[PDB]
Ligand binder design. Structure first.
Ligand code: SF4
Lengths: 505, 143, 317, 114
């Protein structure tokens, strides 16, 4: 029941140019249906993996073994942590496809748009589902190419082809360090997989095995908001249609950039090297990212650039938790932080999608990126501003919402670990409170002369807001039930390497 | 239209006086009717700072031409049941300023006054007598 | 669970009776201190009813928060009553429940500032940026004192640490000779916090002074004003109940189903004695100060004494 | 942190507080007069919407949420911090490329030794 997450998006993507000859509005209603079926298949594969097992799969023979004693075919391994990424990427994608019917309809050539937005959520499943080391490179490349082609889409604007060039010419260099790592890691060991390579890596360590890790992690740190290399995101967010930035601040940062580091450190490169070195290497970038990302997220004057610099400062929490979760191996202290850095990914994806769709509606209605001229927007656009108020209260964490219990874990972990990093976190969470309180006081004021003639959006631009707000409220009634049934057993099966390489055999 | 729960404002009035061009003779009597010798807080009066709160306006001075819309502007913002007490011999037709091109006299032709208190300036017991008389009118008006 | 609703209704009715009566006794004492008869004792129970009587006015430039912030203020005060020490250990007191107290005592003032600032004319805009500077400036001074005393009463043994039900087990006054100095430094910082939270004395800045006497609440007019003048009095009772809980809880044992109310009366009497010094005397004896001088006093002569007290009390254990 | 079912009681007491506080307005709207809608703000009553005798209002305020100075020795260091960090982000492509190159070299040099 698990080939049907790759079959249905390929069948939607390769069949879109022959159903656009109906020249009406079938070119959208086919895309919405073919994106809706993937949600059903994602729920069922989530239920099947949480019932029992760590299921492997083999393309070809019923076993990954011929007349030999080592793998031949391409194998899939979807242990408990990939299932959450499969379950959360097939949800915001649906809520962002049914969104853009009324937005992005003044523009031309939206036959290529829907097939690109269906490729996006195709090259992002296969990173989660896979257990081969070269297949990872193709599925990291699909996502990057179509994300280059969705940023520079409005080609006639002054700076839509200015963000695209900046993202292109650096991403196409960072995505070749990975291919040099694979070329340099083939010729020394000889097999091309992720389970059986951790066996062969153990007997003969080489300088190749560390060279092919250094630039390997230095490449995957570009597809994130890591601290020296975070500048492409800051101008890729204002120069985008708002249905794209909701599926680029929430998802593509935390599939190609965090999940990959977690998988290729905790499973391949960890019977041999000290984890204590990679921990202190990661944790320095986690501490530069907080200050650099949330310090200049308070000097702004733009609206979407604010959210771009606020979505690079939440990555520092995830890197800090995932970094502390390595220098301490199996204990109580460094186990509740790896559990505290999984729950924050799913919460950050939900609230940042909710917080970009509302900025899309505001910027579509009156048309000015500046946040200083518009004030009293809640006089003549109330429901939009209330959605912004909930989405702003959920980031910093107020205890009736779900952003509280996702961050108390990182607080108590970093406080029981060392008392300096807790002070770093408290500085980093004072500055974001200052930014959102300031932008909140600009919206409850006197109605300025540029606002007074305005209305609300329709229904199909208002229906995702309801589902997101209901989800992140009812998800907040039960925080400590969902943090012991799901996301402690999730994080215990990340350093459980012996069962991984034993269920492959 | 005055419905029922307004007997209590006869036991707690709040005032706010509107100067329009006086010569500061009666404003002393508004202020000195609250010092410890002529004390008035034991009835419940309390000089408040905005016309949203108050319910007895306390207009002094002859209505000077420049202050003619202000008096008609601060009359809407006081809420319901409210009275107007005119203090002195210059809301009642000017005193020495009845023949100017600048002072349109009696304050009745601008807003509906209820109780006048003559004198120049009235002693502070006469102001207490005036507010007691107007308040018993509005107690009669309830029933 | 249903026995936790009966308390939350009945204690609310009790406190809403008592607090306004304390305010009336306070106005009578302040009036007698300067040769005056003064108003009768139950004077706020008339002012409340006449403010509910009148006609409410909504300005033409007003949001949906103008009509809905004086509901959320009273709501997060009534919901805060269930966590406060009334003399007996509170109803919903678990292992956390200090940060819930600090959070909900901060959050009501932010609802007040958002309700004032969400209107038209910019008297409210200047009367709100003066509010939140004084809000930020007065809450690192109490966090150090309360966290130091809650950490220090947990060494000698308790089962619900960092909880306000743990503050009746063992107090400050039995740690030996060095704690007697931290006692008076801590009496200093808590009396200063209690005077600056209910905002009377030096710190009468954002209430009856917007450039002369306009105030922050220059705009609320009818029912809404009555609700705000009720909520601030309940908060007046709550903060002083915290101050008498931390400093000296000396209650009777008296087992039975009626020792609760005897301890409740004894706590009410201690609340009265603590208000009588601070609010009455410090209001009669000293005028306003400023805003640029009210900030550099809470970071220099109050927050410094909290560090001295916490460090000296740490060197006692 | 607190309890196991304890974040569910918070909602119960909060909703019963809103029910009491909304029931009080539901009572007090009936007894007493209604409402109306005026606009001048009751704020310096001389003018509401006028043009010119001298200069007047409509000089609206931006986001200035600071009117205080602690020890007046911290604002200079904060501004000297934000100035360099503000003009670091130039926007030239060799900055991007040089940053990821020195990051790769830094991780390599640390991983060779220990
Ligand atoms: S009423 Fe008489 S005493 Fe009063 S201001 Fe006018 S002239 Fe002066």
């Amino acid at each position: 029941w698990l080939p049907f997450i790759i079959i249905i998006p390929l069948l939607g993507a390769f069949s879109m140019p022959i159903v656009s000859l109906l020249k009406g509005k079938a070119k959208e209603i086919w895309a919405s249906m073919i994106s809706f079926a993937t949600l059903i298949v994602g729920i069922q594969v989530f239920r099947e993996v949480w019932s029992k097992g760590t299921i492997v799969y083999t393309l070809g023979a019923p076993n990954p073994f011929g007349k030999a004693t080592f793998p031949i075919r391409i194998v899939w391994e979807v242990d408990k942590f990939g299932a959450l990424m499969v379950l959360i990427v097939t949800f915001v994608s649906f809520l962002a496809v049914i969104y853009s019917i009324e937005y992005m309809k003044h523009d031309t050539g939206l036959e290529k748009f829907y097939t690109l937005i269906l490729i996006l959520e195709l090259g992002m499943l296969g990173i989660a589902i896979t257990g081969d080391i070269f297949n990872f490179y193709v599925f990291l490349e699909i996502m990057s190419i179509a994300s280059y082609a969705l940023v520079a889409f409005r080609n006639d604007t002054w700076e839509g082809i200015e963000a695209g060039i900046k993202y292109m010419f650096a991403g196409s260099l960072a995505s070749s360090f990975v291919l040099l790592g694979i070329a340099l890691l083939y010729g020394q060991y000889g097999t091309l997989t992720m389970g059986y390579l951790a066996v062969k890596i153990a007997e003969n360590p080489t300088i190749v095995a560390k060279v092919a890790l250094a630039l390997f992690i230095g490449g995957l740190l570009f597809k994130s908001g890591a601290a020296p290399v975070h500048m492409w995101l800051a101008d890729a967010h204002p120069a985008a249609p708002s249905s794209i930035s909701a599926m680029l601040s929430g998802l593509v940062i935390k599939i190609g950039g965090i999940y990959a580091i977690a998988r290729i450190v905790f499973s391949i490169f960890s019977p041999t090297i000290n984890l204590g070195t990679i921990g202190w290497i990661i944790i320095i970038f986690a501490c530069i990212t907080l200050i650099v990302g949330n310090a200049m997220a308070v000097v702004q004057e733009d609206l979407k650039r604010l959210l771009a610099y606020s979505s690079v400062g939440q990555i520092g929490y995830i890197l800090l938790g995932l970094g502390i979760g390595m220098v301490a191996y199996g204990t109580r202290v460094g186990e509740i932080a790896l559990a505290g850095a999984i729950y924050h990914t799913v919460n950050h994806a939900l609230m940042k999608a909710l917080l970009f769709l509302v900025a899309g509606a505001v910027i579509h209605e009156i048309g000015t990126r500046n946040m200083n001229e518009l004030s009293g927007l809640a006089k003549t656009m109330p429901k939009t501003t209330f959605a912004f108020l909930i989405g702003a209260a959920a980031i910093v964490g107020l205890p009736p919402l779900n952003g509280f219990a996702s961050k108390w874990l990182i607080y108590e972990s970093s406080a029981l670990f060392n008392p300096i990093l807790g002070a770093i976190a408290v500085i980093g969470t004072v500055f974001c409170t200052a930014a959102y309180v300031r932008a909140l006081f600009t919206f409850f004021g006197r109605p300025s002369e540029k606002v007074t003639n305005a209305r609300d959006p329709g229904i199909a631009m208002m229906l995702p807001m309801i589902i997101l707000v209901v989800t992140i409220i009812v998800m907040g009634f039960f925080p400590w039930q969902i943090s012991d049934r799901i996301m402690v057993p999730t994080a215990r099966a990340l350093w459980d390497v012996i069962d991984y390489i034993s269920s492959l055999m | 239209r005055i419905a029922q729960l307004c007997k209590f404002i006869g036991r707690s009035p709040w005032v706010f006086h509107v100067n329009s061009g006086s010569c500061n003779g009666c404003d002393i009597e508004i202020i000195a009717a609250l010092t410890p010798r002529y004390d008035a807080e034991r009835f419940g009066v309390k000089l408040v700072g905005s016309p949203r709160h108050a319910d007895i306006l306390l207009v002094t001075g002859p209505v000077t031409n420049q202050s003619l819309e202000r008096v008609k502007l601060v009359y809407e913002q006081t809420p319901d049941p409210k009275i107007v007490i005119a203090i002195g011999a210059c809301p009642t037709g000017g005193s020495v300023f009845y023949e100017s091109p600048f002072t349109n006299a009696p304050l009745d032709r601008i807003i509906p006054v209820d109780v006048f208190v003559p004198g120049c300036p009235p002693r502070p017991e006469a102001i207490l007598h005036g507010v007691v008389l107007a308040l018993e009118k509005l107690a009669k008006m309830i029933k | 669970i249903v026995y936790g609703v009966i308390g939350l209704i009945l204690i609310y009715i009790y406190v809403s009776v008592v607090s306004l009566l304390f305010s009336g006794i306070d106005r009578k004492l302040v009036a007698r201190m300067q040769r005056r008869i003064g108003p009768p004792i139950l004077q706020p129970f008339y002012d409340f009813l006449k403010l509910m009587s009148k006609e409410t006015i909504i300005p033409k430039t007003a949001n949906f928060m103008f009509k809905a912030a004086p509901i959320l203020m009273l709501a997060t005060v009534i919901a805060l009553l269930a966590y406060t020490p009334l003399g007996f250990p509170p109803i919903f007191g678990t292992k956390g429940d200090i940060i819930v107290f600090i959070y909900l005592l901060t959050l009501a003032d932010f609802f007040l500032v958002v309700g004032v600032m969400s209107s038209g004319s910019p008297y409210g805009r200047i009367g709100a940026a003066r509010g939140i500077a004084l809000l930020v400036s007065r809450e690192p001074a109490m966090m150090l004192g309360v966290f130091a005393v809650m950490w220090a009463i947990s060494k000698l043994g308790v089962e619900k640490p960092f909880s306000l039900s743990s503050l009746y087990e063992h107090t400050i006054w039995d740690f030996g000779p060095v704690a007697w100095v931290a006692g008076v430094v801590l009496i200093y910082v808590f009396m200063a916090w209690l005077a600056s939270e209910i905002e009377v004395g030096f710190f009468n800045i954002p209430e009856a002074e917007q450039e002369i006497a306009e105030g922050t609440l220059v705009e609320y007019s009818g029912r809404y004003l009555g609700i705000i003048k009720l909520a601030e009095s309940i908060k007046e009772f709550i903060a002083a109940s915290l101050v008498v809980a931390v400093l000296f809880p000396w209650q009777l044992n008296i087992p039975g189903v009626q020792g609760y109310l005897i301890n409740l009366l004894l706590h009410t009497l201690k609340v009265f004695i603590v208000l009588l010094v601070s609010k009455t005397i410090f209001r009669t004896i000293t005028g306003r100060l400023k805003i640029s001088q009210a900030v550099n006093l809470l970071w220099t002569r109050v927050f410094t004494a909290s560090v001295i007290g916490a460090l000296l009390l740490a060197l006692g254990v | 942190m607190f309890g196991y079912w304890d974040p569910l009681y918070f909602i119960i007491v909060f909703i019963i507080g809103l029910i009491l506080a909304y029931l009080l307005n539901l009572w007090a709207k009936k007894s007493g007069m209604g409402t109306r809608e005026v606009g001048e703000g009751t704020k310096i009553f001389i003018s509401g919407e006028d043009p010119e005798k001298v200069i007047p209002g409509f000089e609206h305020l931006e986001g200035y949420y600071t009117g205080r100075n602690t020890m007046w020795g911290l604002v200079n260091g904060v501004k000297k911090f934000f100035a360099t960090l503000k003009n670091d982000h130039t926007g030239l492509l060799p900055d991007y490329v040089s940053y990821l190159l020195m990051t790769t070299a830094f991780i390599l040099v640390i991983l060779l030794l220990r």
